Design a protein around this ligand. Structure first.
Ligand SMILES: CCCCCC(=O)SCCNC(=O)CCNC(=O)[C@H](O)C(C)(C)COP(=O)(O)OP(=O)(O)OC[C@H]1O[C@@H](n2cnc3c(N)ncnc32)[C@H](O)[C@@H]1OP(=O)(O)O
Ligand SMILES: CCCCCC(=O)SCCNC(=O)CCNC(=O)[C@H](O)C(C)(C)COP(=O)(O)OP(=O)(O)OC[C@H]1O[C@@H](n2cnc3c(N)ncnc32)[C@H](O)[C@@H]1OP(=O)(O)O
Ligand SMILES: NC(=O)c1ccc[n+]([C@@H]2O[C@H](COP(=O)([O-])OP(=O)(O)OC[C@H]3O[C@@H](n4cnc5c(N)ncnc54)[C@H](O)[C@@H]3O)[C@@H](O)[C@H]2O)c1
Ligand SMILES: NC(=O)c1ccc[n+]([C@@H]2O[C@H](COP(=O)([O-])OP(=O)(O)OC[C@H]3O[C@@H](n4cnc5c(N)ncnc54)[C@H](O)[C@@H]3O)[C@@H](O)[C@H]2O)c1
Lengths: 416, 416
């Protein structure tokens, strides 16, 4: 069992390595073909780049034989870095309990199969609101993300698309064109690569980070063709300083806030001081809350808005030595779920990305060299992978995706 | 880092190895003291058998310093096989978004700390409906379970108690006294130990299993002082045969159905025949659905009823070689969540238990000897541990606990 060269995004290459087959039965197979004829290579015999099963048709548990009939033949013929996606209906919203039971069981299918795919290929489960108009324009951003090299490190996860219709962006290849994005913690690591990706996709980045970071930040802003605001997100006046920086540079409006800045102060709870607790709570939790309410509250972010939070696998599964940190990363899941209704009223989505083992950076190089393999893809991921998920949510056309938590972990063995 | 001798249940011993401290602030600290003065050794300096933090008081994220102030002193003083429990308010039902954010973040705290406790001790998070009457009689079955040797292999999990009031059973030491319990798959393994535990707690067991099992089943029925019904739960007439067996033996009524019978037919989806798919779907999924609707539908199980399903970690995290099996075990989570409302209307709860690495039985004795350690408690569990969780749900006084999925896994590293 050997790790694949994961194909990542590169401009001009086709989204998939092969052709796209779209089986199954229900309200999605048809309109999905129609929406993806243009940019994909539809079947139809020869190396598959992506299998997609419409599951919405399955209305009772006996129906689940369907996955077997569609998948078992085609699997041996799945490409390098191919993409399996099962599209179902939101289980809570089904028309009968029988249907709810069947759609729920799919998660068990998609996650088990993710652990069988070979040569870097991945599975995904996507639920779609049964209130979605038949075109399902609300579903395109998610399918376009999953069926591409962009999702390289996203594996085994569950996306949940709502009812609202979506406008496609002017150019799918540059989706954040003309958007203004605030990135906290942009001097280095994942935060900087978010700036890059956001820039790549056409956005103007406000790159925020502390005085200490000094110039690492300017290097990042110059690199992405953005601006640099040297600010401690925990400062009593962070909201003022940002709204003001926006007033100068972008007429007082911003489209995307990425709450990426974070710290750790790992200690066992037993030997844990107030400063290790309080310092972590302040950056990772209070500030993202305060910044999001702040910025929406004064009109800096309005209709069409996007808030994305950085959660973590620790927030989901816990981790030894991180009761503080994990509280914050679960807290961030808390922000995403609690504010989703309010913000939806205001035309704003909010979603979270939960990284697993990312290389730049991750601790004894005795546990490093192991924890990096403990996932279906057998390798550690890269900042760009996490940034791509984040760019997906930021998309002008991801307006029907809110309240989601997606791990970017290559289906890491660990979880709740 | 070395595995503890887990203290399991034994009649007459005290529920805890030490004294019970109940800190924190909110609507639960007081009434909880009152309800547990009688059977527990309340503080108050010397070896703690159980720490319990009332979290319901925490209404904004800055509040979360509370866990730190209560836990950091007391932790070094935690007994052998001690029990940490944080009791919070259902996050969805909070009065403000701020409170929802704080109560949500607790999960991250309880799971991270579970990975730090020493010498077999465990954490649990329990949410309580803010509609619960101040006495919180609905919460006693859960606290009594967690704070005992009975929960020996339950670690890091999340329980969710509703609003309804509860009557205590006549004798807490024999909670299923006079109840009639149907156990499927009782000839051996976990199913038989459920019969034992159910018998121990005063119940009359109908022990069901196939013809093949022949006598293993009679040995179990004679052992528990029950009756033996030799029946393939997938048979077109399983519901008739059981209602009829009940008509003879228990005046046509049963109080508890345990949907424990299951099989595997592990194969990779790629090389998977119809019979490995269909055979597994039929026992593990269609039959538990058909049996529960069947038995409630003809009045065999009525008000005061209890349905408990056997799910699995595979159903939650997936597993290689088990797309069929995991579909069923996720399916079983599907049954528990889909039927909870309907059945609640009828005075019936339904809940699921998801075992992890249980010894009798679990595959190469090269992966056995590893997978058994991959959990906070560093050892594989035992059938009795799984049966105890199940007996907890069956309790006459667990009427405010429905729709729950609890893993019995000693906080196994693997999950979603
Ligand atoms: C923005 C950047 C974020 C992204 C980067 C990441 O997230 S990467 C970060 C990943 N980090 C992790 O996964 C956490 C890994 N870290 C660790 O395990 C931790 O460093 C550690 C537990 C070893 C350190 O904890 P501490 O310093 O509190 O405690 P320490 O190891 O010194 O304990 C020894 C003494 O404390 C007492 N003690 C009390 N309880 C004890 C216990 N349960 N186990 C051992 N010792 C204990 C004993 O009396 C003993 O003497
Ligand atoms: C009631 C009792 C239930 C409670 C008990 C439990 O749950 S305990 C059960 C726990 N079981 C598990 O955790 C699952 C562990 N089992 C396994 O891993 C499985 O036995 C297995 C994958 C090795 C067997 O799968 P198969 O028989 O379908 O396939 P096999 O290993 O022979 O594959 C070899 C051939 O198939 C093809 N092939 C196709 N895809 C392949 C792939 N992804 N990886 C390797 N081979 C592949 C190749 O051409 C190759 O030649
Ligand atoms: N594998 C890991 O990197 C991993 C895993 C899970 C989650 N995450 C999360 O993803 C995010 C990125 O982590 P990273 O690996 O790039 O670490 P990093 O430490 O390299 O990057 C964080 C940046 O945030 C900045 N920052 C810290 N406090 C700040 C403050 N108060 N105000 C403004 N800026 C501040 C730091 O200067 C730093 O430049 C974090 O939120 C982290 O918690 C990381
Ligand atoms: N560690 C593991 O044991 C583990 C892990 C997770 C979940 N589970 C689940 O817990 C339950 C118990 O498993 P077990 O380890 O005791 O395995 P087991 O095979 O020893 O016990 C199952 C019993 O069910 C009986 N049975 C099978 N099909 C039946 C049918 N159609 N009708 C009536 N009886 C039938 C079998 O005869 C057997 O006696 C199963 O549902 C299993 O899926 C087990």
């Amino acid at each position: 069992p050997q790790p694949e060269t994961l194909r990542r995004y590169r401009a001009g290459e086709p989204p998939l390595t092969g052709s796209l087959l779209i089986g199954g039965a229900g309200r999605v197979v048809e309109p999905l073909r129609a929406a993806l004829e243009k940019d994909y290579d539809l079947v139809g015999a020869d190396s598959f780049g992506g299998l997609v099963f419409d599951a919405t048709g399955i209305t009772e548990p006996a129906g689940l034989k369907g996955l077997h009939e569609f998948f078992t033949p085609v699997l041996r013929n799945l490409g390098r870095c191919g993409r399996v996606v099962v599209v179902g209906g939101t289980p809570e919203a089904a028309a009968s309990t029988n249907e709810r039971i069947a759609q729920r069981a799919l998660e068990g299918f998609t996650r088990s199969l993710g652990k069988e795919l070979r040569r870097g290929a991945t599975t995904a489960l996507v639920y779609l609101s049964p209130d979605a108009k038949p075109a399902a324009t609300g579903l395109e951003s998610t399918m376009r993300f999953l069926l591409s090299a962009k999702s390289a490190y996203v594996d085994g996860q569950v996306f949940s698309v709502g009812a609202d219709d979506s406008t496609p962006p002017a150019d799918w290849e540059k989706p954040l064109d003309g958007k203004v994005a605030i990135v906290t913690g942009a001097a280095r690591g994942i935060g900087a690569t978010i700036a890059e990706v956001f820039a790549r996709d056409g956005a103007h980045v406000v790159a925020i980070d502390v005085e200490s970071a000094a110039e690492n930040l300017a290097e990042t802003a110059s690199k992405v063709g953005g601006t640099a605001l040297w600010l401690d997100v925990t400062a009593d006046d962070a909201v003022d300083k940002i709204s003001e920086h926006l007033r100068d540079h972008h007429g007082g409006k911003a489209d995307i806030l990425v709450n990426n800045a974070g710290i750790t102060r790992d200690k066992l709870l037993a030997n844990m001081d107030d400063a290790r607790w309080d310092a972590v709570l302040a950056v990772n939790l209070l500030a993202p809350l305060r910044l999001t309410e702040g910025l929406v509250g004064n009109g800096s972010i309005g209709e069409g808005g996007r808030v994305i939070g950085l959660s973590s696998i620790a927030g989901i599964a816990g981790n030894r030595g991180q009761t503080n940190y994990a509280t914050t990363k679960a807290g961030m899941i808390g922000i995403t779920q609690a504010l989703a209704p309010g913000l939806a009223a205001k035309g704003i989505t909010i979603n979270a990305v939960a990284p697993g083992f990312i290389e730049t950076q991750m601790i004894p190089l005795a546990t490093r060299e192991v924890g990096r393999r403990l996932n279906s893809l057998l390798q550690g991921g890269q900042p760009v992978d996490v940034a791509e998920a984040i760019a997906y949510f930021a998309s002008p056309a991801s307006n029907a995706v809110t309240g989601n938590v997606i791990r970017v972990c290559g289906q890491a063995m660990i979880g709740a």
